[PDB]
Design an enzyme around this catalytic site. Sequence first.
Site, PDB file in Angstrom:
ATOM      1  N   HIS A  77       0.798  -1.205   0.000  1.00  0.00           N
ATOM      2  CA  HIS A  77       0.000   0.000   0.000  1.00  0.00           C
ATOM      3  C   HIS A  77       0.845   1.275   0.000  1.00  0.00           C
ATOM      4  CE1 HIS A  77      -4.220  -1.727   1.080  1.00  0.00           C
ATOM      5  NE2 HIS A  77      -3.598  -2.413   0.142  1.00  0.00           N
ATOM      6  N   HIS A 244      -0.915 -12.532  -2.563  1.00  0.00           N
ATOM      7  CA  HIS A 244      -1.985 -13.336  -1.969  1.00  0.00           C
ATOM      8  C   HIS A 244      -1.573 -14.834  -1.736  1.00  0.00           C
ATOM      9  CE1 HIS A 244      -5.222 -10.061  -3.031  1.00  0.00           C
ATOM     10  NE2 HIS A 244      -4.281  -9.625  -2.207  1.00  0.00           N
TER      11      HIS A 244
HETATM   12  C1  HEM Z   1      -6.186  -6.462  -7.510  1.00  0.00           C
HETATM   13  C2  HEM Z   1      -5.291  -6.062  -6.641  1.00  0.00           C
HETATM   14  C3  HEM Z   1      -5.531  -6.341  -5.234  1.00  0.00           C
HETATM   15  C4  HEM Z   1      -6.695  -6.383  -4.522  1.00  0.00           C
HETATM   16  C5  HEM Z   1      -8.104  -6.028  -4.981  1.00  0.00           C
HETATM   17  C6  HEM Z   1      -6.310  -6.734  -3.184  1.00  0.00           C
HETATM   18  C7  HEM Z   1      -7.238  -6.863  -2.177  1.00  0.00           C
HETATM   19  C8  HEM Z   1      -6.915  -7.175  -0.888  1.00  0.00           C
HETATM   20  C9  HEM Z   1      -7.836  -7.219   0.227  1.00  0.00           C
HETATM   21  C10 HEM Z   1      -9.295  -6.868   0.225  1.00  0.00           C
HETATM   22  C11 HEM Z   1      -7.162  -7.628   1.299  1.00  0.00           C
HETATM   23  C12 HEM Z   1      -7.771  -7.815   2.670  1.00  0.00           C
HETATM   24  C13 HEM Z   1      -7.541  -6.625   3.613  1.00  0.00           C
HETATM   25  C14 HEM Z   1      -7.960  -7.038   5.014  1.00  0.00           C
HETATM   26  O1  HEM Z   1      -9.169  -7.248   5.186  1.00  0.00           O
HETATM   27  O2  HEM Z   1      -7.155  -7.179   5.983  1.00  0.00           O
HETATM   28  C15 HEM Z   1      -5.811  -7.934   0.870  1.00  0.00           C
HETATM   29  C16 HEM Z   1      -4.832  -8.488   1.681  1.00  0.00           C
HETATM   30  C17 HEM Z   1      -3.534  -8.595   1.276  1.00  0.00           C
HETATM   31  N1  HEM Z   1      -3.014  -8.293   0.065  1.00  0.00           N
HETATM   32 FE1  HEM Z   1      -3.983  -7.754  -1.523  1.00  0.00          FE
HETATM   33  N2  HEM Z   1      -4.978  -6.966  -3.123  1.00  0.00           N
HETATM   34  C18 HEM Z   1      -4.434  -6.676  -4.296  1.00  0.00           C
HETATM   35  C19 HEM Z   1      -3.110  -6.718  -4.684  1.00  0.00           C
HETATM   36  C20 HEM Z   1      -2.049  -7.054  -3.815  1.00  0.00           C
HETATM   37  C21 HEM Z   1      -0.680  -6.940  -4.083  1.00  0.00           C
HETATM   38  C22 HEM Z   1      -0.146  -6.410  -5.379  1.00  0.00           C
HETATM   39  C23 HEM Z   1       0.002  -7.426  -2.977  1.00  0.00           C
HETATM   40  C24 HEM Z   1       1.435  -7.636  -2.656  1.00  0.00           C
HETATM   41  C25 HEM Z   1       2.345  -7.906  -3.543  1.00  0.00           C
HETATM   42  C26 HEM Z   1      -1.010  -7.823  -2.031  1.00  0.00           C
HETATM   43  C27 HEM Z   1      -0.756  -8.374  -0.811  1.00  0.00           C
HETATM   44  C28 HEM Z   1      -1.705  -8.553   0.170  1.00  0.00           C
HETATM   45  C29 HEM Z   1      -1.370  -9.204   1.438  1.00  0.00           C
HETATM   46  C30 HEM Z   1      -0.008  -9.724   1.884  1.00  0.00           C
HETATM   47  C31 HEM Z   1      -2.549  -9.271   2.141  1.00  0.00           C
HETATM   48  C32 HEM Z   1      -2.823  -9.824   3.533  1.00  0.00           C
HETATM   49  C33 HEM Z   1      -2.859  -8.876   4.712  1.00  0.00           C
HETATM   50  C34 HEM Z   1      -2.822  -9.631   6.029  1.00  0.00           C
HETATM   51  O3  HEM Z   1      -2.461 -10.817   6.129  1.00  0.00           O
HETATM   52  O4  HEM Z   1      -3.110  -9.029   7.100  1.00  0.00           O
HETATM   53  N3  HEM Z   1      -2.238  -7.581  -2.585  1.00  0.00           N
HETATM   54  N4  HEM Z   1      -5.685  -7.652  -0.486  1.00  0.00           N
END
Ligand code: HEM
EC number: 1.11.1.21
Lengths: 713, 713
Positions: A77, A244
């Site tokens: 982010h 993810h």
């Molecule tokens: C289409 C693009 C993306 C969408 C719509 C998206 C959406 C989300 C959402 C909704 C969450 C959940 C937030 C929460 O409720 O705690 C999340 C978690 C996360 N996203 Fe994505 N994401 C995107 C791209 C990425 C990218 C590019 C990365 C890293 C390279 C990433 C890494 C993460 C990680 C590591 C989590 C987990 C957070 C945790 O474990 O507390 N995401 N993402």
Amino acid sequence: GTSNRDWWPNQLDLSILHRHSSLSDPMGKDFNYAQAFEKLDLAAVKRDLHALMTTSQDWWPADFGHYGGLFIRMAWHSAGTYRTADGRGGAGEGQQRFAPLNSWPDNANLDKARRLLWPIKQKYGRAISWADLLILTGNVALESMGFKTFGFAGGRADTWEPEDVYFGSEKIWLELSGGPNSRYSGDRQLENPLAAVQMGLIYVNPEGPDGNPDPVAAARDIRDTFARMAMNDEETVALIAGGHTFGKTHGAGPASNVGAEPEAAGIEAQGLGWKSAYRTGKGADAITSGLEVTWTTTPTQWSHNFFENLFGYEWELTKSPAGAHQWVAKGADAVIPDAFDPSKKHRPTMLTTDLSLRFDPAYEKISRRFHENPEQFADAFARAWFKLTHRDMGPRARYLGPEVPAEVLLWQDPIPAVDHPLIDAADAAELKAKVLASGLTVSQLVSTAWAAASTFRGSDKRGGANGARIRLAPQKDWEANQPEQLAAVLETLEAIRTAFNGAQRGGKQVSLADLIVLAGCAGVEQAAKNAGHAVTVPFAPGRADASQEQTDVESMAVLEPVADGFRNYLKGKYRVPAEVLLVDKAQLLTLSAPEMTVLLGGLRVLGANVGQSRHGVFTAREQALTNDFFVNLLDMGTEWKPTAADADVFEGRDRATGELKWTGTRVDLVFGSHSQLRALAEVYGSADAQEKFVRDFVAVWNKVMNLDRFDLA
Amino acid sequence: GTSNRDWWPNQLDLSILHRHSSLSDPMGKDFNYAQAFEKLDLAAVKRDLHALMTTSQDWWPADFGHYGGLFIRMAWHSAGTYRTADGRGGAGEGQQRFAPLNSWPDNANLDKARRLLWPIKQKYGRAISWADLLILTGNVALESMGFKTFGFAGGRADTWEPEDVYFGSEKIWLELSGGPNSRYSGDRQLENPLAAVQMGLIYVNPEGPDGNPDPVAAARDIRDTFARMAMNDEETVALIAGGHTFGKTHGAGPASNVGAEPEAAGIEAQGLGWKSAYRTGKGADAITSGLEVTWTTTPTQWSHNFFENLFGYEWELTKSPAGAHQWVAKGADAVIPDAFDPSKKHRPTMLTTDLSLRFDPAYEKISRRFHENPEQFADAFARAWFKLTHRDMGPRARYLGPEVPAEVLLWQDPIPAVDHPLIDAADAAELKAKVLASGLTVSQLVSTAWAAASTFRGSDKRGGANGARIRLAPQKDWEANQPEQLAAVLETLEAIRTAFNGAQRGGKQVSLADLIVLAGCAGVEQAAKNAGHAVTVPFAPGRADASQEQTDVESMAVLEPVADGFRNYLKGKYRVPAEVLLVDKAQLLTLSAPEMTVLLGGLRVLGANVGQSRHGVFTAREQALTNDFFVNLLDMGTEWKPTAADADVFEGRDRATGELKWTGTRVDLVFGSHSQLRALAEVYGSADAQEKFVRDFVAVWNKVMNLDRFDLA
Ligand code: HEM
Ligand code: HEM
Ligand SMILES: NNC(=O)c1ccncc1
Ligand SMILES: NNC(=O)c1ccncc1
Ligand SMILES: [Cl-]
Ligand SMILES: [Cl-]
Ligand code: NA
Ligand code: NA
């Protein structure tokens, strides 16, 4: 308390040019962040960060006992606000810790993540910035969980107040498209310079476009937004599937349980927000996005399980406990671990936007390749992650510390190392004399150097005269650069260069990049002489010439000026008034209001206008460096009116006789209208100001010429 | 474009602390206005201004062929924004040329008057500021029309951006009272710190209160507003009758003919506004206030005909051609000249607020005396005009040029000349040792010096430690100054002083004003020593001691701190949150946000709180100069909650055990809440910051001690 902004909401805002003053900065005027960081024990910071990963705090307990997923999202982010249109956003200023970004809905509970880092920040102090630390923490999270990163560079200096960044015009967080301030028009065309689909999101809506759970349609928004953040299909798939692979989302109960965002919360919340009334309000009970998805069977370990799941199951649309659209695997066993309770397991789940990676045909092919060849996936993700997190850092000369990758990447706009003696003061004098003896005019020399140097923007530190990319595609073809005039100037300069280089002994040679800049300085010197002032313009050698193959033509397209008030140029007709675009450009060039004012008035009389327009050329001695622009602008003997043909062009007529004296644009006349700008014009239009004008113009010229010279930092 | 201000309209605004950066200033960093002004040929400026008085421009023809009346109004309005409550407004920064004042309804067509002055400004350049020129032009107008002024001082340096000034909460110009944002409550009580009756007026409505044409009621608003601008009855009558000896008002046709104010006008208007569609739009046809009154038979010559008319006729209520209430002389001959047609004459007319000077009983007695003794009227007006136009200029040491009056005036808060050798560095060290040996504590020494120095406000440059007025009425009995503790400290210091001065030869002696400041410096040095750090606090001698007889006790009332967040002090319960009042105080003290942050954190641990409150005293080694405030404020091991007793007081309890550790106010905890303030706290709370904290604290302490020392400029 009613303010000027309330009375005159559409008036021009200059305070964006006077952000980041020494007043707001707690560090001394001599503080050099690079020097501090070079003495940091980076290895010791990394150990501490590794230990932090599994040291759970009760006020925000670590999912699965490991904060890695949370910190990867934090770093993603930090970087993911970036926009290629203006270079604004990105991780490079640590702006996640200020408004509005600290309080965006998509950054919910990243206030917890940043607070976890305070003890480490405190320990190491000024030797590591917040901006560097957010990214380093993402890297270490990846490393801790078994993924080897491509590298890391320090050198992102902290900033001390919020940036002024246009993130859109909507007055409601997360507003869906088609409202009164819609960022979409036409066939879902996103307005420049925006790179997110809704106000307060990083890129796209995880449920689908405007909340409609169609993975195919979602894939269109992904492609568009990630392209606007400098990422192609391969990079985009690598990043989303890579991200993810780790961690989980949080949506344990309804979103109405969640309270005020940090900037709206009570003083007792001490800088945190989104306090939740749902059960314990944290950990097992956490609510962040409202979705409740855990992607892999090992959320705290690198694996190949994202794509095994994506392809290995068919997916059924369902809802989270907060009511959000998401997907669950048809007929699956409960193989996904729970974050807190070892006696619970769950079926595989996915977001709509994860399914995009399978159901968009172009992404499908990449996803399959990465499924079948996980080592290609690993490499692509490591490279994309590095790119994402360093995109806005500028030239490689700015990269600090012991983990900087040696590989030079195309996206870095690389500049060859200089391997030979540079020209000295005598050589410079000799080259300037040759340039002036060639017959190139003041106007040609100043225009060409301005064209070359003024592509720089401080938002992402791209552009500038280093590289001599003005001679390459696409810069050589840009309308603002006057391609035909430019070709003729570059041909003459190339001949001068070849003959000088031919005559040298030892290694000595001059780059075209340097000679362009040097020849502009000669033009300024000549203009000063034309006005009877004896002036030397400073010049620093050491620029090198990049090749076409070192110059990604697509990526360079975003640097094209479609508005450059300094050349009285507007490529088309826009909704934003031209003087707003001038101030925006001045900000990207790092100019104050006084610098902007002096620069523009000088360039007008030197003949820098595109097409040799007369607009704002308020002098009868063009190509002489004088303060005529200001003296004539401010003359009450002239009355101004918009033209019948074009209300954006103005005629200045003698008040007594009606005789036409000048014409100008909005950009020209704003200096005689805006009350702060006119006060600056007055200084330079005063009878005692001719030498001041000249000397201030020389200083700002030189500053523009050197904007990208991080090799001299 | 949605901004932080739009999302969080109640958050604290720090940008007011970062105005006037070197970024927005076109002059070099070494520019010294005083030095430029002292070389100005003032007499030549005055001759040019004298010629201008009767050189009409056809774009704004001069009434009666003379601009004097217009320029007297221009200068009166430049000065007449002043408010005693905060010292904001006044002529001293030339703010009439910026928003919002350039566009207030009451400043209509003073844009013309300022434009008439451009040729002279342009001629003399940086050697005369706009701020000085507005006032000087008023003086020269008066002089040219036969009135002997009291004097003139230069030294008002120009400013380069609008001030952030609370002028009220109304969202409509001139809104009548009793609205949703009414500036009146109770029995017509005007809210502090306002000094005008409606938004965009200088003082009162010329038709009468909220438009009701009753001279008796109007006189109540006159008295109130003029008192809030530092003027008593005699001064008020002298000024209003004095001004309205000259010129005329403008209301030739309906006011709906008048277009946009300057900040709302088109770019082609080049900084002017109120363009009128009525007939020629100017001269005979001008519309400014909408009233059409000409007071005397010789509007371009000083006379005593204002009072001859006021008393020699009875007055009938009538309407201007624009519809405004005004008065005409019953049964009078047409004896008043027309401004443009020498064959036309008019009956005497008056404003409602002019009739106030006759029909208010207290004003009536003054007006009769001035009627019978026009020489008393002339003298009172000259004195009041000087005072009006110099009220905000600060100590006489700031007054420049060859027309400064020699007479010292009580309202100037005068400081006696120093006629003896000053103490040297050895003497200062000896005095600091004596002070520390007396048994006075760090807390006592720091608190007393803070109390003495921190009355300074940069808005009108009143207050500060020069004068030792803390030992006099009323300062010595202000609650914030802890009168009983203060008396004990002053007694000890006076005995030290007497003994030092007694032992000297050769005239050397130390003032109590200097010794109070020096004793505070000893306090800070001792606190540093207590923390294990040897520092010298800078100290500059040369302050003098003022007498009670040289101190206007009523005028000193406005300098009383009713909120001083640096001493965790609030005299009562206010509508404005205490952290907003802190930032307001920091602005008056000329502090940046970092300076504010460092100063407050140090003062808390030195024991500067009023009444020795423990609020915000986050240290276990009080009276040692350390960064404990920041380290403890930022500790995530402590959880904060408002108290049941008092929502503005917070308990900090250990998160694990619930044990009470600290208490704090909103002013204390804002530094852990506000995202920009917390970033600054972080720096000073880091493990590498003890030496930085001490050094920055010493620097801002010294800056505060020296705020009024324009004798060293
Ligand atoms: C289409 C693009 C993306 C969408 C719509 C998206 C959406 C989300 C959402 C909704 C969450 C959940 C937030 C929460 O409720 O705690 C999340 C978690 C996360 N996203 Fe994505 N994401 C995107 C791209 C990425 C990218 C590019 C990365 C890293 C390279 C990433 C890494 C993460 C990680 C590591 C989590 C987990 C957070 C945790 O474990 O507390 N995401 N993402
Ligand atoms: C109760 C306080 C005052 C009120 C309500 C007031 C009201 C007015 C108004 C409504 C005008 C006409 C504006 C226009 O239509 O052009 C005016 C003109 C003027 N006022 Fe005042 N005034 C006050 C105090 C003063 C003071 C203190 C001075 C100077 C010492 C002053 C000097 C003048 C002059 C010189 C003009 C003539 C402007 C011209 O000739 O163009 N006034 N006043
Ligand atoms: N929004 N931030 C910028 O545009 C910027 C920041 C740093 N240098 C130049 C421009
Ligand atoms: N509104 N402006 C002030 O309050 C001020 C100006 C200059 N120094 C201190 C305070
Ligand atoms: Cl930004
Ligand atoms: Cl002000
Ligand atoms: Na950026
Ligand atoms: Na003031």
